[PDB]
Structures are given as structure tokens and as C-alpha cells.
């Protein structure tokens, strides 16, 4: 059933890091502006656990300085209030996040010139972070998605090399394994899960921003290209709403995009469905 869930976009960057929280209703094409983040945030990730939206990591970059964030903040859509949570062990700009068993996993990202391979897990019930096994590769501008209680970390930049590699985290055994590499080097891609596939959309290959999109089928263990987006974009937001992928904003090599495109896997087609109220990159996005 369609029950009225919305796409939330938190933070982002346009001329400086932003504090916006806005919700898009794909059913009627409307945008609603919600309570601002207390502190502006770009390069963060969003997720939802237990009906709450979490904004994880990122950076505040403006004429008042450039500082990476270890923050975790929680937004309750029922109260339209943000609440601070326990911070992570380290700041993580251009972080990846995924949720397994009601816990938030934060992977990679950067703190100054440090490119993390470390990974930590947040338990909402105890408002506590705990370090788990590190990735095999340092990854900033990494994308993450979860399928059947496995977490995939895809692409990024290791401090020297921009990556086509990907790896999978097995939470019960607390270990990582490299999986098949992508066709394309991508940092700052949008990574999500839809059906049995992990998608990597857009990103930066070291030369250009990308409009290509590829997906990893966890059964056949292959990466296959699907239809490209209309707009090249890196530092895009991505999420899944009612069985379709939505990509929000990003940087195309010239402009900070307000474009939102929607992918239907049944027709293998992208369409532009709306525009954000202002163009931005580096947003955190989730659905509830």
C-alpha cells in the first residue's frame, strides 16, 4: 500500500554547507520545509531507524571554516524536532552509512587528510557507538547499501587511488571481503539497493562527473550497466521510494543541480520528476 512516506533531504552544499531539511512527496510533487539542522552539514549521510531520521557525519565548509563532523543527530518527523545523539569516534566527511538489525553502521570518510578504513556501529537503545572490523580499503566518497543483513561499501578514494573496488561486511562474523570490482572508477557515487542488486549511480572517475549507472546482482555476482541518468552528477543523494530509485542534486562539473531523477527498473528508464527548491550537492537522504 502507498501510505504517504516522504523523501527527506538533509543538509548539502551550495556556496557553503547548508542546514535545510525538506521533504518531497512523490505522490503530489510537493516539497515541505522542515526544522533546520542546528549546524550546517554537507557530505553527510542519512538513514532511518525506528521511524527517526539520522544525519551522520559530513562537514561544515563555509567562510567560517572547513571542519569535518563526527556528529549524529536525530530528527523525529512526528515532532519536527532534531535531537543530538552520541558522536562517533572520529569525524567522517563523505561517509557511507547502512542499517543492519536496528543499528547504524558508519564507514570510511575523511578527517582532514586521514582517509578512514574504520567502521563503527551505533545502537539507538543505548545511544552508544562501538568500533567493529575495519574495511580492507580506505574509502572516502564511499557509498553503502544493505541487502539481507550484508553491508556493501562501494567505490570512493583511498587517499591516492580512486576506486572501482567494492567490499562486503558480514556482521555476525565481523569481517569484510572484497567482491567483484565495478566497471567504472567512482568516488561520490550514489549507492542503494533495489531488489537483488546494489546500484552505483554517477560519481567522479578522476576525469569527469558521470551519468552512467551500474548494478551488482548479488546472485550472479556481476556488475552490469543500466540506463544512464540525464545529468552527470557526483555527490548526489540517492534513495528508494515505493520501488523506484530517486537521485537528488549533485555536482555536474559546472552546476550544483536541483534536478531529481527517478529510475524505474521495469522500463530501465530515468525521468526528471521534480526540482529541489535550490540546487545542492552532498546531501543526506532517506525515506520514512
The full set of domains in the chain, from first to last, is 1-288 (2.120.10.80)
What does DSSP say about strands 175-178 and 128-131: parallel, antiparallel, or unpaired? unpaired
Strand segments, DSSP code E, in 78-202 are 81-84, 96-100, 103-107, 110-111, 114-115, 119-123, 128-131, 143-147, 150-157, 162-170, 175-178, 190-194, 197-201
Determine whether 24 is exposed, middle or buried from the number of CB atoms within 10 Å of its CB (0-12, 13-18, 19+). Answer: buried
Three cell numbers, residue 200: 552505483
Neighbours of 253 (CB within 10 A): 12
DSSP label of 14: S
Nearest of 52, 91, 58 to residue 75 by alpha carbon: 52
**Block residue for cell numbers 587528510:** 113
Nearest of 218, 287, 275 to residue 248 by alpha carbon: 275
For the chain, the maximum distance between any two Cα atoms, rounded to a whole number of angstroms, is 49
Question: Distance between CA atoms of 274 and 136, rounded to whole angstroms?
Answer: 38
Neighbours of 10 (CB within 10 A): 30
- Long-range Cβ contacts of 260-264 (<8 Å, 24+ apart): 260/24, 261/229, 261/230, 261/231, 262/26, 263/201, 263/213, 263/226, 263/227, 263/229
DSSP label of 256: B
Question: Distance between CA atoms of 16 and 41, rounded to whole angstroms?
Answer: 9
Half-sphere exposure of 108 (CA within 13 A, CB side): 32
Q: What is the CA radius of gyration of the chain?
A: 17
**CA 249 → CA 21, 26, 231, 257, distances in Å?**
14, 16, 10, 5
Q: Resolution of the deposited coordinates, in angstroms?
A: 1.4
Amino acid at each position: 500500500p502507498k501510505v504517504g512516506r516522504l523523501i527527506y533531504t538533509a543538509g548539502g552544499y551550495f556556496r557553503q554547507s547548508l542546514s535545510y531539511l525538506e521533504a518531497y512527496n512523490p505522490s503530489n510533487g510537493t516539497w515541505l520545509r522542515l526544522a533546520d539542522l542546528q549546524v550546517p552539514r554537507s557530505g553527510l549521510a542519512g538513514c532511518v531507524v525506528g521511524g527517526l531520521l539520522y544525519a551522520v557525519g559530513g562537514r561544515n565548509n563555509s567562510p567560517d571554516g572547513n571542519t569535518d563532523s563526527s556528529a549524529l543527530d536525530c530528527y523525529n518527523p512526528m515532532t519536527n524536532q532534531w535531537s543530538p545523539c552520541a558522536p562517533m569516534s572520529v569525524p567522517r566527511n563523505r561517509i557511507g552509512v547502512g542499517v543492519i538489525d536496528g543499528h547504524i553502521y558508519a564507514v570510511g570518510g575523511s578527517h582532514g587528510c586521514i582517509h578512514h578504513n574504520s567502521v563503527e556501529r551505533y545502537e539507538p537503545e543505548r545511544d552508544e557507538w562501538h568500533l567493529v572490523a575495519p574495511m580492507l580499503t580506505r574509502r572516502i566518497g564511499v557509498g553503502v547499501a544493505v541487502l539481507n543483513r550484508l553491508l556493501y561499501a562501494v567505490g570512493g578514494f583511498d587517499g591516492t587511488n580512486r576506486l572501482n573496488s567494492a567490499e562486503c561486511y558480514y556482521p555476525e562474523r565481523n569481517e569484510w571481503r572484497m567482491i567483484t570490482a565495478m566497471n567504472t572508477i567512482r568516488s561520490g557515487a550514489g549507492v542503494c539497493v533495489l531488489h537483488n542488486c546494489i546500484y552505483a549511480a554517477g560519481g567522479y572517475d578522476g576525469q569527469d562527473q558521470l551519468n552512467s549507472v551500474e548494478r551488482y546482482d548479488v546472485e550472479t555476482e556481476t556488475w552490469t550497466f543500466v540506463a544512464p541518468m540525464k545529468h552527470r552528477r557526483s555527490a548526489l543523494g540517492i534513495t528508494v521510494h515505493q520501488g523506484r530509485i530517486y537521485v537528488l542534486g549533485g555536482y555536474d562539473g559546472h552546476t550544483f543541480l536541483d534536478s531529481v531523477e527517478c529510475y524505474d527498473p521495469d522500463t530501465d528508464t530515468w525521468s526528471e520528476v521534480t526540482r529541489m527548491t535550490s540546487g545542492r550537492s552532498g546531501v543526506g537522504v532517506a525515506v520514512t
